[PDB]
Each structure stands twice: as structure tokens, then as C-alpha cells.
Design a protein around this ligand. Structure first.
Ligand SMILES: *[C@@H]1O[C@H](CO)[C@@H](O)[C@H](O)[C@H]1NC(C)=O
Lengths: 24, 40
């Protein structure tokens, strides 16, 4: 998790995943 | 005034329903996407 490099203005929406990370 | 300000777009998003099928019941729930709904 500490080795990755993961905001909205106009119509862009980032839906959250159905399964959260602690669930996985 | 030579103050500095910030521009954040005011809230938008899709509305979406929760329906259990019409032949089961008629009540639905409604979801408002990314709204800190103190307000409607
Ligand atoms: C909604 O806004 C209030 C105002 O600061 C804040 O205290 C609260 O934590 C916010 N809720 C969420 C889920 O962001």
C-alpha cells in the first residue's frame, strides 16, 4: 500500500468501490 | 481589495433510487451522490 501514487470539477465523479479495502 | 479567494464548484451529482421491485413493495429510498446533506 505504501508503494503507489494514487479531484472533481465538472461532471467528473469517482464512485467508491463496493468492497472497501479492509473488507478485501 | 487585493484579497485572495478560492473557487470550489458548488455541489452537483447524480440522484439514484433504491427500489426492491414494484411487485414486492412501493417504498423506495433515494441516494444523493457526494452530498454532506445538512441541506436537501
Ligand atoms: C459536513 O460539514 C460539517 C461542517 O464543517 C462538518 O463538521 C462535517 O464533518 C461534514 N460531514 C462530512 C461527512 O463531511
Amino acid at each position: 500500500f505504501n508503494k503507489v501514487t494514487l479531484q472533481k470539477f465538472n461532471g467528473l465523479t469517482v464512485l467508491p468501490p463496493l468492497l472497501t479495502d479492509e473488507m478485501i | 481589495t487585493l484579497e485572495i479567494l478560492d473557487i470550489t464548484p458548488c455541489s452537483f451529482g447524480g440522484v439514484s433510487v433504491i427500489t426492491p421491485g414494484t411487485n414486492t413493495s412501493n417504498q423506495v429510498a433515494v441516494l444523493y451522490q457526494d452530498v454532506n446533506c445538512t441541506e436537501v
